[PDB]
Amino acid sequence: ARSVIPPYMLRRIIEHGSLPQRDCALHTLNHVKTSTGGEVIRDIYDAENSTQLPGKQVRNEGQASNHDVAVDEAYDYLGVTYDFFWQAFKRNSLDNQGLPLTGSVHYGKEYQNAFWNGQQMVFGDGDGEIFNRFTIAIDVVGHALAHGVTESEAGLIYFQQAGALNESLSDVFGSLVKQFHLKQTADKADWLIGEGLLAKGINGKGLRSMSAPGTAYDDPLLGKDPQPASMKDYIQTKEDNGGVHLNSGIPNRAFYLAATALGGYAWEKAGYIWYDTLCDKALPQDADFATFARTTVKHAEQRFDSKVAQKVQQAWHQVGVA
């Protein structure tokens, strides 16, 4: 299971939070027909605050709203994610085989996470004091779904730089889904991961910033955003699967810089370049930052031209990936 809130963030809550705050985080941490191209198939379930999946079926494809905000958001944001991948890249669902998009809401009691489990999305309600409901932010929904895309293509392992790249691809595609939904060019996009997910009172903008890694939060409870912004400050650790959540800001910032330099809608050039790279049969499952970067420059040349390739190469250079 790929969960959006990392273990070190929950551990931080367990040590610094109030009794009820510690308790929900502890339970969260310790917990153990296909579509034809162009038309999504969704099925949304209600876990009714138990942890049995998928739960009770509440809204299948075309079914009217049951007026539960969580079900509405799951249904709508799974739809927008499908539409993005079809309109931008002519891809038919997460696996390019028309996989129906399944989601279960109200998982557990005050469950402080959301995750893709290899076959479906699962969403917690949050606690209302640190995190809001986990259907609330469209980019976070897209981020988690995007792990299914990566698994069906290059299949990058969840370890060190390959794992940081796996995380970064989810942030890239989650951001593009949001920008597509809001009709934003690169110069207008917020470039935040999880805007709206942090509860009122928490001192932060979101989980991460793609433009300025390390600046997203600074709160007595949650701690300080640990992400470095360049390779000079890359963290060498065996913790966090070798730093998959710590060091993803470096490739995230490379994408931000590339998209900024190219202008217009970020999915049309920079996005397509990253997509071509993920789908490249020569990209190894244990690829490092340097190998991934070189591959993006090749596809920039291939799909576009030398000027676009220059701008992509300079973005990687700026964040310290030679």
Per CB under 5 A, residues contacting Zn ion are: 2, 170
Of residues 5 and 319, the one with the C-beta less far from Zn ion: 5
How far is CA 182 from each of CA 35, 136, 176, rounded to the nearest angstrom? Answer: 25, 15, 10
Q: Residue 218 CA to chain centroid, in angstroms?
A: 21
**From the CB of 233, what's the least distance to Zn ion, in Å?**
22
Read off the DSSP letter of residue 291.
H
Angle between helices 306-318 and 249-262 (to 10 degrees): 140
Segments in the chain forming alpha helices (H): 7-16, 19-30, 69-89, 138-152, 160-182, 239-243, 249-262, 272-278, 289-303, 306-318
Of residues 2 and 269, the one with the C-beta less far from Zn ion: 2
Of residues 21 and 241, the one with the C-beta less far from Zn ion: 241
**From the CB of 163, what's the least distance to Zn ion, in Å?**
10
Phi, psi for 105 (deg, rounded to 5): -105, 170
Q: Are strands 101-105 and 121-123 parallel, antiparallel or unpaired?
A: parallel
Of residues 77 and 265, the one with the C-beta less far from Zn ion: 77
Residue type, 312: V
Ramachandran sector of residue 90 (left: φ over 0; alpha: ψ -120 to 50; beta: rest): left
**From the CB of 104, what's the least distance to Zn ion, in Å?**
18
**From the CB of 262, what's the least distance to Zn ion, in Å?**
25
Of residues 143 and 299, the one with the C-beta less far from Zn ion: 143
**From the CB of 170, what's the least distance to Zn ion, in Å?**
4
**From the CB of 84, what's the least distance to Zn ion, in Å?**
17
Q: Residue number with the shortest CB distance to Zn ion? A: 170
289's tokens: 């930052």
Of residues 106 and 245, the one with the C-beta less far from Zn ion: 245
